[PDB]
Amino acid sequence: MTELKQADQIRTWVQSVLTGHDWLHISRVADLAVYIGEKENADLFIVETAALVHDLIDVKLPDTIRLSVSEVYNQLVTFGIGKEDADRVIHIITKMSPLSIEGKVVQDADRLDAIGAVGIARAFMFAGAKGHGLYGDDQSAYAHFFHKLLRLIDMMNTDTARELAEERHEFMLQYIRQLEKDIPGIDA
Amino acid sequence: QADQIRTWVQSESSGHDWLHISRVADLAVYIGEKENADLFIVETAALVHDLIDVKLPDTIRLSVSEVYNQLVTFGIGKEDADRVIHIITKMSFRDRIEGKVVQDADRLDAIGAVGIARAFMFAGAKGHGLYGDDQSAYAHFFHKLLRLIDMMNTDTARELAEERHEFMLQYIRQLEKDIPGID
Numbered sequence: 001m002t003e004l005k006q007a008d009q010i011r012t013w014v015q016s017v018l019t020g021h022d023w024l025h026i027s028r029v030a031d032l033a034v035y036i037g038e039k040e041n042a043d044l045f046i047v048e049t050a051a052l053v054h055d056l057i058d059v060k061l062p063d064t065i066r067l068s069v070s071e072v073y074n075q076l077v078t079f080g081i082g083k084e085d086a087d088r089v090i091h092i093i094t095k096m097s098p099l100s101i102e103g104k105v106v107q108d109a110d111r112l113d114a115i116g117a118v119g120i121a122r123a124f125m126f127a128g129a130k131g132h133g134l135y136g137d138d139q140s141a142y143a144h145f146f147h148k149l150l151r152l153i154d155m156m157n158t159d160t161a162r163e164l165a166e167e168r169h170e171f172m173l174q175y176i177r178q179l180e181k182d183i184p185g186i187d188a
Numbered sequence: 189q190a191d192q193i194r195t196w197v198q199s200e201s202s203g204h205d206w207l208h209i210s211r212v213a214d215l216a217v218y219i220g221e222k223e224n225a226d227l228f229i230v231e232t233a234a235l236v237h238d239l240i241d242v243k244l245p246d247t248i249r250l251s252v253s254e255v256y257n258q259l260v261t262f263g264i265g266k267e268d269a270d271r272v273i274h275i276i277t278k279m280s281f282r283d284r285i286e287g288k289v290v291q292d293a294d295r296l297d298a299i300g301a302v303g304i305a306r307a308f309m310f311a312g313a314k315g316h317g318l319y320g321d322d323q324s325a326y327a328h329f330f331h332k333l334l335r336l337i338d339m340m341n342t343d344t345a346r347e348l349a350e351e352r353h354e355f356m357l358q359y360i361r362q363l364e365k366d367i368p369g370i371d
């Protein structure tokens with residue numbers, strides 16, 4: 001398939017460019033976005049392509065790596081993606097940083113990778129990276145569960161992503177419960 | 189007196205932070221009560237053991253004598269100063285009843301939900317992967333964390349370790365659902 005080859009092209013590029021926004025996160029989010037897209041009857045090629053390049057423009061990437069919108073667009077077109085599809089992908093990644101149907105799917109997959117056991121891991125790695133405490137202040141990893149991560153299930157766009165988020169969100173709840181036991185007074 | 193030690197020791201992005209020390213002193217003190225240890229010794233040794241650790245950097249790392257002489261200055265007896273110094277030197281060298289308790293407290297804080305957290309904080313602080321290397325957080329579970337339960341000295345610690353260990357397995361199972369092909 002033209003599309004399979006183009007997906008593969010995009011994957012190698014994205015991996016090359018990038019090598020909590022590492023290739024492994026992007027690859028997980030692409031796989032998850034395609035699964036949700038399939039269930040949701042969204043356009044699979046747009047979902048996967050947007051999922052793969054969504055972080056390339058993100059203000060969080062260091063400046064040796066981060067791309068301009070025109071750089072992503074030109075690379076897509078060079079790789080054989082029609083201008084119309086390329087426009088749609090561009091619409092999604094710029095909105096992400098009403099989102100389109102496929103944009104909502106990608107956003108959902110992205111938020112799913114921020115919850116469950118994976119999201120817990122990513123949260124504590126971030127805290128470790130930025131020199132924040134495990135708990136004890138408003139910049140802490142534990143605070144971030146309450147400010148953000150535990151609310152993500154309410155922000156899911158699709159039924160499919162809402163269904164997947166349930167088990168992950170409940171698992172974060174079990175994780176918080178275990179921290180409350182391992183560490184009496186953690187909340188105060 | 190234990191209050192004057194808690195102020196000084198408070199005065200680290202490596203896994204040897206204050207919250208960990210404070211956690212482990214409270215745990216040590218709890219375990220020590222069950223295992224009939226000298227609670228003042230346990231709390232003090234728990235509070236100061238990391239100060240001389242070779243894993244702690246040069247800019248912070250204190251010498252044994254500095255720890256001894258600071259303790260004596262806060263007004264500790266020679267008896268208890270020697271016992272504490274005994275404990276913290278036995279724990280802290282390269283290729284490492286009151287010591288057992290302090291060691292158990294320390295190990296326990298490396299497992300369960302809390303240990304998961306510190307492992308990932310560690311991997312983040314040193315720039316290591318979530319998974320994929322032998323140097324990754326996920327690898328450390330199998331290399332170290334999942335076998336800590338079988339290195340516990342006291343009955344009390346062994347019992348506490350069970351639920352923490354079982355939870356780490358639940359965590360790892362969820363992670364394998366979240367990340368297909370993580371192995």
Ligand SMILES: Nc1ncnc2c1ncn2[C@@H]1O[C@H](COP(=O)(O)OP(=O)(O)O)[C@@H](O)[C@H]1O
Nearest residue numbers: 020058060114119122123124126127140141144
């Ligand atoms: N204040 C915080 N404390 C702990 N983890 C965080 C914090 N902010 C973001 N994270 C986590 O770090 C990862 C990277 O997030 P970030 O780069 O800030 O936004 P995004 O990944 O959505 O572009 C995500 O899993 C996110 O949940």
Ligand SMILES: Nc1ncnc2c1ncn2[C@@H]1O[C@H](COP(=O)(O)OP(=O)(O)O)[C@@H](O)[C@H]1O
Nearest residue numbers: 203243298303306307308310311323324325328
């Ligand atoms: N390779 C690793 N990956 C993830 N976490 C680690 C690794 N090595 C140590 N840690 C974590 O950092 C903390 C401190 O461990 P370490 O300094 O090795 O032993 P100790 O402090 O008990 O002498 C612990 O929570 C431990 O699990």
Ligand code: NI
Nearest residue numbers: 025029055110
């Ligand atoms: Ni992302």
Ligand code: NI
Nearest residue numbers: 204208238294
């Ligand atoms: Ni320690």
